[PDB]
Amino acid sequence: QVQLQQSGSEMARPGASVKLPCKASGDTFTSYWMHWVKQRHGHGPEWIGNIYPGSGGTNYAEKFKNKVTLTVDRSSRTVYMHLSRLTSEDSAVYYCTRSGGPYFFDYWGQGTSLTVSSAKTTAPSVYPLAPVCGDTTGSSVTLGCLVKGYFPEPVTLTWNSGSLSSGVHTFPAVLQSDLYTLSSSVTVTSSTWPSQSITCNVAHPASSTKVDKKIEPR
C-alpha cells in the first residue's frame, strides 16, 4: 500500500524554474526506480527520466536532458524534479511513478498540474445559483454554483465540504478573455432542499482563497 505524494498544482513565470516534490512513503523507496512523466491534456504521456534513490543514479530523455535535473532527499524519502527556463510548452501535468519487477508504473502520484504564465493571479467570484424564483416544485431540485473570472487553474469545488458528492456535475473550466469560468450543478430531492443546508465551497490555491456560498430560495 505505497503512496506517492505530489502537490496538486503550481504556477510559474516564463524563464523561471520550479522544483516539484514526490514523497514515497509506505516503505522501500530505496530499491525502486522513481520516474517522472509528463502529460499534456489526454495525450500519450511522455517519459522525462528516472532516478534510483537507493544508490543514486539518473537517466534523462534527450528531449529533457538540458532542461531537467532529478535529485533526492533520502531522509525525507522525497524525489524532486527541477525544470528550468520555463516556457508555455512546459505547462502540463507531471506525474511521479515507480518501476520495478515485471512491470513499469504500478503506482502513481496524483500528478502536479503546472501552469507557466506571466499573467496575474485573480481570485474567482463565486455565485450561488438557486432555482427560478417561484418555479413549480418537482420531486427533485437542481442547484448550481458559478465560479467566474479566475486565473490560473485550478480551483477545487465541493458541496458541503465534500460530504455531498452524488448527483453532482462539475463542468470543465473554460477560458474566455484571459480568465477561467466553471460551474457545478447538484441535484437532490425536494425534501433535502431547502429543508437542509447545501453550500458550495471553492478553493483557489494560487490566490490562497477559500469561499463558501449557501444556496437558498430566491
Binding site: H35, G42, H43, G44, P45, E46, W47, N59, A61, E62, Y95, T97, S99, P102, Y103, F104, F105, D106, W108, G109, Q110, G111, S125, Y127, P128, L129, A130, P131, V132, C133, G134, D135, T142, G144, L146, K148, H169, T170, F171, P172, A173, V174, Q176, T181, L182, S183, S185, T187, R218
Partner: protein, 219 residues
C-alpha cells in the same frame, strides 16, 4: 526512440460488446532478457493512469479477466469482452523494453447506451453578481445520451449567439451519460433591458427542443 502507434483514436462500443484496441511498435521490443515489456494503461479524466496488462498478456492484480492482451513482433492487441460502464476512459499502450520508455497516443473508449433525454434547468443571475454589475444566465442539460446536443439562447423571443460559454462533462462512469453547461453572459443593464430568457435544448431524443425559460421580474 520506439514509436508506439495506437488505433483507433476513438472507440464507441455497446455495453456487453467486445472492444479491440491495436498498437504497433516501430521496432522489436523484446528486451535482452527475453521479456517484452508491452503494457496497457487505463486513465479516467483527472486521474493518474492505472496499469491493466503487463508483459503483453499478464493481468495486473485486481483486473477483470474480460481484459485480455495479446500480440508479438510489432503488433499488439488489447481486447475487452463484455464491455461495462466502468471501462470508460483512454487506453494507452506502452513499451518499457527500450529507453526512453514510450506510450501510444491513446484510444478513448466511449460507452454506447440507450438514448436519454436531458434534464434541463435554467438559472437567472444571482443577486450578488448583479450587485457586481454583471449578469450570467445558466442552463444545465444533465444526463443525456448521445453526446451530440445543441443549446440556443433567446432573449424576449430573439436568438442570442454572442457571450455564450459551453462546457461538457466527461462521460459518466456509472450511467454512461453526458451533461453540458451553457452560460450566457450580459451586462446588468442589458439584462434589465429585457424580461424573458430562454435556453432550448435540441437533442436526438426529440423532434422538438426542450424549452426552459423565466421572466426576470417574475416570481
Amino acid at each position: 526512440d520506439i514509436l508506439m502507434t495506437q488505433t483507433p483514436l476513438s472507440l464507441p462500443v455497446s455495453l456487453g460488446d467486445q472492444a479491440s484496441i491495436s498498437c504497433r511498435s516501430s521496432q522489436n521490443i523484446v528486451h535482452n532478457n527475453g521479456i517484452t515489456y508491452l503494457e496497457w494503461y487505463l486513465q479516467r479524466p483527472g486521474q493518474s493512469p492505472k496499469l491493466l496488462i503487463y508483459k503483453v498478456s499478464d493481468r495486473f492484480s485486481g483486473v477483470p479477466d474480460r481484459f485480455s492482451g495479446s500480440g508479438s513482433g510489432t503488433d499488439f492487441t488489447l481486447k475487452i469482452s463484455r464491455v461495462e460502464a466502468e471501462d470508460l476512459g483512454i487506453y494507452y499502450c506502452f513499451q518499457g523494453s527500450h529507453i526512453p520508455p514510450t506510450f501510444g497516443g491513446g484510444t478513448k473508449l466511449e460507452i454506447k447506451r440507450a438514448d436519454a433525454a436531458p434534464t434541463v434547468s435554467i438559472f437567472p443571475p444571482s443577486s450578488e453578481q448583479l450587485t457586481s454589475g454583471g449578469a450570467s444566465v445558466v442552463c444545465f442539460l444533465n444526463n443525456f445520451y448521445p453526446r451530440d446536443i445543441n443549446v440556443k439562447w433567446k432573449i424576449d423571443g430573439s436568438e442570442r449567439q454572442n457571450g455564450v460559454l459551453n462546457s461538457w462533462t466527461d462521460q459518466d462512469s456509472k450511467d454512461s451519460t453526458y451533461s453540458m453547461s451553457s452560460t450566457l453572459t450580459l451586462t446588468k443593464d442589458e439584462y434589465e433591458r429585457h424580461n424573458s430568457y430562454t435556453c432550448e435544448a435540441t437533442h436526438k431524443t426529440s423532434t422538438s427542443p426542450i424549452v426552459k425559460s423565466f421572466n426576470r421580474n417574475e416570481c
